[PDB]
Point group: D2
Chain length 254, copies 4
Amino acid sequence: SSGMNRHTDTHYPSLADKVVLISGGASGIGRAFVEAFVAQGSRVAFLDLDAEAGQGLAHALGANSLFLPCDVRDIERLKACVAEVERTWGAVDVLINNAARDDRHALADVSVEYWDERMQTNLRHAFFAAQAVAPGMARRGSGAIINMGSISWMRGRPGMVCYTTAKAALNGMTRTLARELGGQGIRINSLVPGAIRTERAGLEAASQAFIDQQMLKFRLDASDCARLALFLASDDSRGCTGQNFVVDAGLSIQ
Amino acid sequence: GMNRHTDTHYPSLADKVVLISGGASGIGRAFVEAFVAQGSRVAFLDLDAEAGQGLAHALGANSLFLPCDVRDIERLKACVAEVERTWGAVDVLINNAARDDRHALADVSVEYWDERMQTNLRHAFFAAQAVAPGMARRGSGAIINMGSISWMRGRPGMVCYTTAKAALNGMTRTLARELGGQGIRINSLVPGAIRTEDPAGLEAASQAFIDQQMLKFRLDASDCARLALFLASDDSRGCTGQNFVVDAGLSIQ
Amino acid sequence: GMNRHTDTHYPSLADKVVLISGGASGIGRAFVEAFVAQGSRVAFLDLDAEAGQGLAHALGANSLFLPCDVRDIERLKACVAEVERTWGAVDVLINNAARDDRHALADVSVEYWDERMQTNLRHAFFAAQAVAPGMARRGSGAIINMGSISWMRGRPGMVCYTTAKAALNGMTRTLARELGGQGIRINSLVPGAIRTEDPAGLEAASQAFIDQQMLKFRLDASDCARLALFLASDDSRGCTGQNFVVDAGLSIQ
Amino acid sequence: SSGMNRHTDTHYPSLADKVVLISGGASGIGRAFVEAFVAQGSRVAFLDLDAEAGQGLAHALGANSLFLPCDVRDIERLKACVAEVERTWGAVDVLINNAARDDRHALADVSVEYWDERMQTNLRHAFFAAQAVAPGMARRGSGAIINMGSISWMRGRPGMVCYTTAKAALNGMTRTLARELGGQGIRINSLVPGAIRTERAGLEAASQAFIDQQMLKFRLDASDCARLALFLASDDSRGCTGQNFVVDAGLSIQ
Ligand SMILES: NC(=O)c1ccc[n+]([C@@H]2O[C@H](COP(=O)([O-])OP(=O)(O)OC[C@H]3O[C@@H](n4cnc5c(N)ncnc54)[C@H](O)[C@@H]3O)[C@@H](O)[C@H]2O)c1
Ligand SMILES: NC(=O)c1ccc[n+]([C@@H]2O[C@H](COP(=O)([O-])OP(=O)(O)OC[C@H]3O[C@@H](n4cnc5c(N)ncnc54)[C@H](O)[C@@H]3O)[C@@H](O)[C@H]2O)c1
Ligand SMILES: NC(=O)c1ccc[n+]([C@@H]2O[C@H](COP(=O)([O-])OP(=O)(O)OC[C@H]3O[C@@H](n4cnc5c(N)ncnc54)[C@H](O)[C@@H]3O)[C@@H](O)[C@H]2O)c1
Ligand SMILES: NC(=O)c1ccc[n+]([C@@H]2O[C@H](COP(=O)([O-])OP(=O)(O)OC[C@H]3O[C@@H](n4cnc5c(N)ncnc54)[C@H](O)[C@@H]3O)[C@@H](O)[C@H]2O)c1
């Protein structure tokens, strides 16, 4: 559907028919991944807690898009959602650990219950999702995992300690997983966005603030993220593992 | 009788109130002994009661052992409040308690992951949260997060421990910014392969670390403690947000 | 007959003007061939005239070989100006020319150091300086600095080469900021141990890199070229100031 | 002399009588090193192109301070200055590569002659000085090298490409030298300052700008640098090599 963003004009033959799985795929950046992979002719499954948003997107993208309802805090349902994907299409080729929650919170405000919840939606699934797809990949001898990272912890960003600390956690989980699974043919990297404009006056000011702080004087959008994801998924990046790829218009270096 | 760990003397450490988690054994013990030798008032937390009691008794009246399982945040909070009740606001927090037991990626259950994160990461946040208001009232404080080179070197077979350690690398930066306007500096102390209490199997493993290191000698707990004293003292007053790596070059191979 | 290096097709590369130093052989050749396959106009510089001539002849009318010894800044400037005269402003500069010959710390003279810095670092600055005004007039441009993991891994026995490579790591960041307001993005492409044209001695060394890598296969020039195409294309339009490391995990050990 | 800053109250017995060599020692940060080591009772030699500044400082600090005139661009004189130090006191214990020139310069303005000169005063000496002191150290089985680094290249600071690129060069030269010389007992690290107030209206504003950007809301001065240098020199840091130690009040993380 010409209504839905293709995100790039580039064509990656190596993505055709690969099985892709994206968590938090129904909105924002996750939606752009879902769109971009479908446009390259992958078989794309995504998970999201918003069922009516997920259903609309699968309906718009057609039969090579699959929407599986899932709350990533429930590891049981996450492993079930994985098993379903592997049942329908085979072993996953490309896992994108994207689901996350970046609501702001002062350090003094944080209760034990909040911290545990935030760690569960922000960090713990990426581990269990990678744990779930790994053996299928290993059986085949190949696959790719992308962990969505953030420059927020790199820039020491205050006021959201559970989210920045999870993002920092994934930076390290990428390296060690890379080592643990590389012998099996599985490459793992972190895609690290800067300030991506989405849909999640004073808005104009905040937007100009980013442009003033960035090296490249235009705003980043979800397309910039998906363009990096397609490269990281494709055979073009087959020797890259353990690494961060930062798409942030220079905002992390100031 | 006690390991003093350095002949250096830091006048700025005299009388400072120092709180260390997992202080009864290993690295944490070395911190406890080193800061006591500098004249600090040192409170430490540990779930090993017998080890903690013995150590406090051996070090005397400027050591205080509080029993605490760091997974229990309420007890952690209570231990902090009691330190502040006895000696006033903490000057120096060292988030040290950790469990680095090996575990294969394939075998980790939800429950293991939650517990390993709670032992290895969660408490460092809550301990910081507990000491911050007392620090801010006084206008000064230092926090030291014990880090690890293991995640930097992509070390396999202990994903919960390395991921926690990588978590604290980020938590250092962001809390440094969030609290530094209150006068609180926060850094991570990042050791390499520290020797701590098949003879050939041990000897061989120890030789392998020497062979891979740039400096050809084994590191021990004293190396750690000497870095911590500097990171606590007024000599590092302007350092915040940073890692300081004591690893004989093991991380650069 | 030619290595195309990828089956990927980047429409944004069609007709772009690409300048590569040390393009006649090895990695630089792979760049030359890969961008020509995408429909770009590719100019390359090299001191090996016979290799450059043959390559331009083999690739045809959208390849231009300019003889150039990159230590000679005046010639470097002249080659840039001639590219701009034939095809207009450069779209994509790849600072590639380097010499990585081994040399012991103890034995390096002033003259060796100066020459090794001139071959390995200086030209990348001047080449950037030469292409920047033409980029700025058009409002867009990309620069790629070929980096190395060797300094990151503290590799001994070639101090001039590793120090140059570490120099470009910093030069990437600062030129990214200085030129990005003009629309010019700058990144470093950082390969691991790339196979390029005692059999047991070679086989063993190659096996050692496989053993230390995370992915168990040897990297080649094509791996490099496929990253460069992405870093040149509109797919990386928002990436600047950054390293992109293609090393099969060799740098994380 | 009570007139001269001691920089710390800390006492390091392991520094007593060690031989220290500092390039660009007569002014600013280099002067603070010279003062701090003398106060710990080291034998301190420094090099500087400003003879009358160097003479004044050696006169003020007394007989365990030695001032050797030197233009660090002249590698010959630098190796001679080293040989003199080793002749008078033995092998150097602690080398601090501090001399540098941070005049601003637009990228378009830079001529070949400028670039080569700047690289010579900013980078090339640190290599040759480390080359000169190394064999004496190796003979003894011990020593320490500190390379003065800068957060400027880390923060992608524009308008001084020769200086930031040299600083970036030394970041890498620290790692590789660490490996090359570690078997000999020589440890090498980079001391990396933030915005240090020195003596090198609108000044007040610029100063407030740093405080606003820093995490810790006070200015850094030369003492902060020397306090780190003494630790890096002493036996207290005997297991630390190959590393950066950044003293910048959080300015690099923003
Ligand atoms: N916005 C940016 O500038 C930016 C920058 C850096 C990193 N990122 C990262 O990009 C990724 C995508 O972020 P986004 O901005 O599109 O977020 P978003 O919240 O706009 O959309 C993410 C999706 O995740 C879903 N989701 C949230 N909780 C979930 C749960 N428990 N189970 C299942 N689905 C759940 C949301 O409903 C939504 O569908 C995240 O990893 C985030 O950290 C974003
Ligand atoms: N040993 C090394 O090579 C090494 C290397 C890198 C980093 N580190 C870091 O050093 C720090 C100290 O480590 P160590 O090697 O001495 O560890 P250790 O396991 O020997 O000792 C840690 C201490 O914590 C206590 N402890 C553990 N769990 C606890 C809990 N739930 N409640 C209370 N106390 C608890 C233990 O009883 C022990 O006294 C840790 O943060 C570790 O991450 C150690
Ligand atoms: N080979 C690897 O494993 C590897 C690893 C990391 C980084 N790199 C980087 O890859 C880039 C390409 O390297 P390579 O391995 O193909 O090197 P190479 O030495 O095989 O080829 C470099 C090319 O530059 C040309 N050249 C050298 N000096 C020149 C000069 N003064 N004037 C003009 N041309 C000159 C050569 O003639 C050759 O064609 C270099 O920047 C190197 O730093 C290579
Ligand atoms: N100022 C800061 O905020 C800051 C920040 C980061 C790094 N640094 C670094 O700190 C170190 C000291 O800098 P500073 O600010 O005190 O500089 P300064 O210029 O104030 O004093 C440095 C000394 O070096 C001398 N010198 C310069 N050229 C020389 C030459 N060719 N031969 C011999 N001596 C020479 C100067 O005359 C002076 O005596 C340098 O390595 C600099 O990069 C400074």
